[model samples]
Target: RYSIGFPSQYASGVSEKFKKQFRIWIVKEDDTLYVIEAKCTHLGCTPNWLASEGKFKCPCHGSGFTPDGINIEGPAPRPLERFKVALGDDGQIIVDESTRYRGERGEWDKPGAFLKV
Candidate 1:
């Protein structure tokens, strides 16, 4: 599951178009933050984040992922993909899906994969 905490104003009164247009998931672990795309690497299924279990489980084919989006089990060949992220001039978090992060291609550390807390 992709979990993002939006501003209270946006959460309560954001436009549906904006809601659907921006699917951002920020996974913060200590001083490291991971911004990822919600789709599963196996077959585009959205995984469920089990906070209690500390992992993501894909319902379609039983793929599993860690809190950092690492594929740990099932048919998933790789980890979940990520979108490029940056802070806007207005201080809003910006996510650009057009610039994707592919772990298999060694692009995970190519600058915008994660940010320091």
Candidate 2:
């Protein structure tokens, strides 16, 4: 099996500092991997990943989130929504953006929330 990291080597213009600002961000927590949506749950503002601060900062309303999408401050009612992730038979990581795990809706514990790392 094979695995790959986000912001792939071919993502020439994407630097670590701005990678998470895009629509999606891939993160790992302990032994699990998560595919997170980059929009701020409070008002749909795109968050900026601050490596030095080790957190995501939302410019619209000052919401902050941990790398794993946990809301830590501001108006965000819950963590960033998560996309379903699974390992593909071809050894690639399959991210299903159609299905979202909403923390506010108590769906974070669903079967497809995160994939084992």
Candidate 3:
């Protein structure tokens, strides 16, 4: 599966309140950095890693996710849910789910907290 600290490692799809199999795709474009959740909003499916297409694709329902984790296809209502990530002392990434964020209207633009670099 995946690696996480505390009770998170013990909980899976059934026990955890939210989706446990999550991976944030962090991309860098010069000084601009962006991150997004790698889980499909519809049916909680883990889309295939289509590096060639530059987006994740849900093989089950044909839903597609852009590199930024925005649901660009299928029946997804909003963009993938976002986690608040903070830079740790050892140049590691630390995410706190208590700071879940949903995008705004039209497009799923990240909040100010995401731009803290």
Candidate 4:
């Protein structure tokens, strides 16, 4: 099931946490929500959320991503990608993987890149 349910980070967790299956991270801060996809831009390897390291560390090439999913290290060509997020008519949260927001492509400003609570 690619669909799931709303707000409060989809009640996914109290804070940042990775969805291993989806390879995505659900982050909600301030008045916006960030659905950070975990595929490493280097070679599509999934990165780990190393809160102890204070960033996302890729297993393969050591790509580093900020908590907000911005790339700040070498190896990775760009920041991690993000899935489209929105609210359904039923008021449920939606994460559409078919649409992605990429940092290198400057697609982060595109519509559906981020959702508001």
Candidate 5:
């Protein structure tokens, strides 16, 4: 288990897997810290962080998503998966990717209620 609070610094990086492309992005907009999964739901492709487009665009396909993990356009049935993110005792981010999710609507994002102040 880890703390729900996140650090102030913005962080971003890609995680390498055996046969897949995955990305982890820690973004700060306004004054909130958001740890987002930057993968496309279409074919498990890593999405480009399109700041100018204000959305995530999958290079492998045409899938797109908002910074909040909501899918904007694509063949994806639901939003991208989001792991359980928390701050560890050492002030480092701990993401539990083992916690798979389809990011379907309503229950997951919960209207930013999951965000900790």
Candidate 6:
């Protein structure tokens, strides 16, 4: 039911929260950025970012995910889903919620999965 746009350049770190209301977290890793959906792969529950621990932990079942969106523990069958991103005319980053890239499904190599700046 939505989309989001923001500046592409960011310091190397998790931006804490962006659209937590919409279940998405915007994080920048080195020269790349990923908009990881907050919904858990295990049971569609939302996962929260642990800034102190630098990991994503799901509350419903204790599934853990890393900054790269890969599952590290618990029963989550796969990594968190990533929304496709595209650069806007003004260099803004636009997240395409309509298009999703699931890491374990061989969709991660698709163009919009990782925004390498």
lDDT of 3 by residue, 13-42 (tens): 112212335555554433444445666788
lDDT (10s digit) by residue, model 6, range 1-117: 344456544567766546546678887778788788888989888888887887998998999999888999999989999888888776777778888998888898889887887
How would you order the candidates by lDDT, starting with the best? 6, 4, 2, 1, 5, 3
Return the lDDT, model 2, position 34.
68
Q: Residue-wise lDDT of candidate 2 within 1-112, one digit each (tens)?
A: 1234342322221134324333776676666666778889897888887878888899989999988788999999899888877777665676677888987677878888
Off by over 4 Å in 2: 1-22
| TM per candidate | 0.76, 0.77, 0.63, 0.83, 0.66, 0.87
Q: Show where candidate 4 strays beyond 4 Å.
A: 9-18
lDDT of 4 by residue, 1-115 (tens): 1544657435422144447666788876566777887788888887888878778899898789888788998599788888888778887767889888886788977888877
Stronger candidate by lDDT (3 vs 4): 4
Task: Count clashes in each candidate, considering only residues at least 3 apart in sequence or on different chains.
Answer: 3, 0, 0, 0, 0, 0
Give the per-residue Cα lDDT of candidate 5 at 86. Answer: 59
> Measured by TM-score, how close is model 3 to the native structure?
0.63
Tell me how candidate 6 scores on lDDT: 0.80
**Model 3, C-alpha of 83: deviation from truth (Å):** 0.9
Q: How do these models rank on TM-score, best leading?
A: 6, 4, 2, 1, 5, 3
Please list the C-alpha lDDT of all candidates, in the order they appear. Answer: 0.66, 0.72, 0.55, 0.75, 0.58, 0.80
**Model 4 clashing-pair count:** 0
- In candidate 1, stretches whose alpha carbon ends up further than 4 angstroms from where it belongs are 1-21
Ten residues in sequence with the least summed lDDT for candidate 2:
6-15
The residue pairs that clash in candidate 1, if any, are 1-47, 1-48, 1-49
Top lDDT model: 6
Off by over 4 Å in 5: 1-6, 11-22, 29-31, 105-115
